[model samples]
Target: SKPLLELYVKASGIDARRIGADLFCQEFWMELYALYEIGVARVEVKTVNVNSEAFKKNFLGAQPPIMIEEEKELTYTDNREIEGRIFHLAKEFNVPLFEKDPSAEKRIENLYRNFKLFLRAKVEFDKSRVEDLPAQIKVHYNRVCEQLSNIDQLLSERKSRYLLGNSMTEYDCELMPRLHHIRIIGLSLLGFDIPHNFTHLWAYILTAYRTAAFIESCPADQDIIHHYKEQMNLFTNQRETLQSPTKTHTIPEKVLSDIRVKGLAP
Candidate 1:
């Protein structure tokens, strides 16, 4: 007797775009999403707020057990390793490598220093608008490619397995999705080519995609990307239309009333 709600108490990170971090985060979620479709296990895309009161009450109140997806908290080994590689490469490549900025250091001293106000003005006050987050992503991606180029050269003398081995590790589970996103969207969607001609990383990612687990988990035969976009757009547009700064929505109250009207008690 698993209704949709009982089978999955969905939390909000459901939006693939929101769940997907730079490179690793997307793979983890994509795997999970695929799992849900195949009925491997019941799953829910929780919002960033997994610990919110409403979220807790929704699942626990119904007396159905919950298993929170741990990927959100789990650290990605590749991300850390890649970042470390980039840090060293940035220094070698001379791309203005300063870890601790003087301005940021001073700003952190006072938590109440109107940082929110500054950010809001940076948005509303600025003439340059954020159009689809592509430009911003390209800025970082270009730097990533530059750093990767230096690192690849540095590792040339060393063995191929020195940087990343032949076999896929736990980290690759997270890395694959991100690399795919970059290949398709990061370059096409953002108009930025992955630098360094890092054919090895690209090959590694493509090989991973062909693996049985990855292929089974994400068949890619269907138009999943399009489906994701359509669903996301619908939800986003609905929320934007319904949102009101002046009014507080009693979402819980509405839920309870509907349940009560249907003769269900929580």
Candidate 2:
């Protein structure tokens, strides 16, 4: 809910803090931010990675989902849908969804499903040959692009500033990050973008970025560029830096120049 977040920040006189290197980089704080946004009075933050012994024990069920009941507990699980479960708990705690309508629920679910599909495309695309993705992988990639194009059309014709409603909702929170990843990585690495012809889509993206919450929470273009580069190195076993990168996943000269020239505002 980019617009919703912007409105909330404006109305509540709250400042958006940097979410760090990436949104999930600080898992503990991510939870804390969400809770604090929903009006929770107090929250304690802790950091743990999958490799940490505590995380390992918790994952294996040696410990409960939440260690302390006094402080609100947010935990990820493999057995259930993470966002749905967390938002369900939020509802139990009296946190309202972005919009309070039947269609809003459907929009949130759609965003959640599409986000997973986007990641599937990313993983498969990264692991494949640069010259041409495997047919199966290309199918998924095309599918995501199609979904984006459809959303662009919808938003372009939409009367409201936010997706699915006049006000921002939780789905905007879900969508903004994925859009950031695609905007940064898709054009640079995949030789694809949101299609400049999609004016409304481009406008929506620019609007999302213009918001204070987005500016503060989202990583810089360079950081995002390095992140994808690092992911390629780790997973693709290819040492590709932003300077002289992979032939299959090279950033265009113009794109690189824009990265240097274009500040976050536009």
Candidate 3:
């Protein structure tokens, strides 16, 4: 197994419930649960918020998105490529919601718009360290919503647009949490409402939230809030644990000389 990457639960926004509502956040939380539940990854909850110095250190160390980008396989695709990978895999593998419709191109465009909306909204509240965000996060949220509104008006209909018969698939794996994240960000931070007209996407998110995989993966809303607060406390005190040298064992002079004589290149 690759060494366990320590995860710090970063809190976004003024409300923890709203943060939990984001699909990426939920997926992030769920991935941890899946690894632990299946015995694939090991983690100790660091109880640190990403804003904290300690949390920042942990995040720099972890290099996560192992599952999102298939890091186990190290596909090395950029973000857009990875999103395309999800669509391609859904088609190739016949996953439920992401199958290749004749209109797949348009649908993918809508999906991409939805993702940006969340990122843009989050950035507005990310003011203190806003400049630190990756280039993609700097765009405007309202523009994303405008584009999504246009897509919503042109959406197609299908009998099984959001689900399969008995189980979840990679499409839902990728899309549901993101949809959840966008809606939460929209309602709570943007002070805007999700287009109720996009009924299919909304239903899919509601269903994803009910899945045990999702339900069990996230920390309860209160727990997440408490965690963020605790993280701040730890971050402020993180420097107290510095190690000091103590003389525990010393090699005898004869042993050192013997090693020099024997353990040498000849």
Candidate 4:
């Protein structure tokens, strides 16, 4: 059957045993969360090696996150650059994922660049740290932390629960996966306290953590660790066994259960 659209997303695991072949892509997750919420299915999700040269030679060359919707093509590729696509896909699918007002919507949309880049900068930091994360990483990571801190301050000043509205809306959909990865990678890799360092940011994450969509869409901690290790060029290959489906989550239950409380009054 001819497909309505084909999507390219980053892969955490490539084996046929994996479901969806889609994980570790925050930009796609923004679109993905909407699909999870609205229950859409049968779209193509091509898992790609975004860093490889073959990927670089594809449709637009700057990290091919394009969605070929039948014949119509899209080109926003960076995580910071994908907000328009998120809203566009959701709008087409009739999923109310963004704020309705133009100004507020743009305001919330703008914050993603900082948060996404914050995660971006830190994820590249040398986890071993004995050699130190390069000054380039150091400077960028510090700058975005300041920027993220301001976003935290703004959230602290708010009387409502979310960035704009009282309910989970646009930024919530985007940030849930963004910050979750931020927490996982930072905690395991760079020893960052992340949202815990910011009171409002902490609550905001906990709030979104309450959702079934966020929790379920979230990959098991070790899945991300393995993928991160692979990206860091330090992965020790897991022994292959065909006996049964092995465990996916390797994070301690205590740490995971600490915030199991219903996502801040969702």
Candidate 5:
């Protein structure tokens, strides 16, 4: 039997429902869940709160996506770099989500890079570490949305359930959480929305909903909101306040219409 893999993600605490924020940890967690879903790996997960002593203990206190296998260690905060390793794991496990075909490599790599700009801009905007945060996010948001629409265009042409064809490719795992953040985090935090008419993009999200591998990796959208709320002090669950959650975990009606019209399976 292979050694159990250890993965560490950042979270201040869980809500009453036991959900924690994924934030920067989303991609790796998504990849991890996908690997598990495919039966490629057995994993043990650890959550570290930046405000707590555990963060210093397990992590020795640096940002993590720290995945350890046996005595070997692999960790990085870069989206593309992390995805590269996931594809490596996919190939190693003989999973079909990635391929070594030279023709597909560059195109796949390009899309991974394309998704990062808007992600970084939101964090930058949230921090307000620079002047004119609005301008930075505006450019970042538009460029990535344009790239997203083009993919929406591709999905129309390919007419497949998954990106890069019907089976879940590395792109599907990569894009799923991103679109979630774009809708939930973007509109709530950044005062901007993914283009209202990006119908194909919104519809693509339902494909994720129907796939447990993608949806299971998602944190409560409120945890995501809290992750952005305070950069300094981390939140704790001790407060135990009971109010309606802002994060809606259901499929939207528009995507349902698109799914029916597109002949998608549940």
Candidate 6:
């Protein structure tokens, strides 16, 4: 990780001090973790909260994609190569979804679509516009619940450990972080929780929560809570009123025990 960080700083020609600050941001960590997992290190050009004006400028005012110079290598083994790794791993562990079957592709597309929809809901949440989000959230939440039910049924019928089968997949990658955010961030801040009726889904989540990769990538509970609190403070200018007591949430003991048993937690 240190080497990758150094390489990124060198390639981007950015000061190490600026790079260090980027490392601490939770959203920044998401991309960093993803890239690091695939053994890639690219430039860290900028980091900004999604709610900030800089985010708009960084994304909206960015140069559009254009033809690359002929001298620059067209085929490169960099972050795009990292994506190829993701593709290969997705297919290897998630044959049902990434398989050659035509029907499977449609299912994959739908699942990816749902993932994006959930992120959109999260954006509205970040803006403190959750009241405007209920209709979209309601539809997506039910849809995800139904999807979890199907996963439960598949596991029962097939006698497997994971949702689609016995091994983790890109599907798990796509689902886990969003669910983590909803449970940890949304539940704590927005008063949103996954319905208790989705028992199998909850089980799946708890199990995944114990995995090393997930644990490493997931922001600490306090970090997420504090992040949203800061945003709220910005909007309301009532930082004092928003001061939370230490430990707004606790990990369920059973889940913590499972993580310990798996040697993923200290």
Q: Tell me how far the alpha carbon of residue 59 in candidate 6 is from the true structure, in angstroms, after superposition.
A: 12
Higher TM-score: candidate 1 or 4? 4
For this target, which candidate reaches the highest lDDT against the unseen true structure? 5
Q: Top model by TM-score, which number?
A: 5
On a 0 to 1 TM-score scale, where does candidate 3 land against the true structure? 0.42
Regions of candidate 3 where Cα sits further than 4 Å from its true position: 1-8, 11-25, 32-46, 51-158, 161-166, 217-266
Clash pairs detected, candidate 3? 22-181, 23-177, 23-181
Worst 10 residues of 3 by lDDT: 240-249
Q: Which stretches of candidate 1 lie over 4 Å from their true place?
A: 1-141, 150-163, 219-266
Query: Please, what are the lDDT tens digits per residue for candidate 2 over residues 1-266?
Result: 11111001100001122122343332223333565565652444332333346556655742212222333343444213334544665666765543455543554456436645655566656654423866766665666667677776676567445566544455555566557677666655555566555555555565565544344445545445555554446332323322332112223345444433533113
lDDT of each residue in 13-70, candidate 3, tens digit only: 3332223222343444454454445555454433333445653463354422322323
C-alpha lDDT of all candidate models, in order: 0.35, 0.46, 0.42, 0.55, 0.62, 0.43
Which candidate would rank higher by lDDT, 2 or 6?
2
C-alpha displacement of 177 in model 4, angstroms?
Answer: 2.6
TM-scores of the candidates are: 0.36, 0.52, 0.42, 0.56, 0.69, 0.46
Q: Pairs clashing in candidate 6?
A: none
Judge candidate 3 against the unseen true structure and give its global Cα lDDT, from 0 to 1: 0.42
Estimate candidate 6's alpha-carbon lDDT, on a 0 to 1 scale. Answer: 0.43
Per-residue lDDT tens digits for candidate 6, residues 133-159, read 567575765565565455544444544
- Per-residue lDDT of 1-266 in model 4, one digit per residue for the tens? 22244556654453433322233354365456556555653355566666577877774466445555555454555555556655666677776667665544444445446545555566555434513666766665575567557667777667457667575566665566556655666666665546345656666666666655556556555555556556556644455212233323233334344434423333
List the lowest-lDDT window of 10 residues for candidate 6.
6-15
Q: Model 2 Cα displacement at 118 (Å)?
A: 8.5
Deviation of model 5 at 156, angstroms: 1.9
lDDT per residue as tens, model 5, 13-109: 4443434565446656766777887678787777655566756675565666666665565554455666676677777878787644443344344
Worst 10 residues of 1 by lDDT: 1-10
Rate residue 224 of model 2 by lDDT.
Answer: 58
Question: Looking at candidate 2, what is the lDDT of residue 125?
Answer: 60
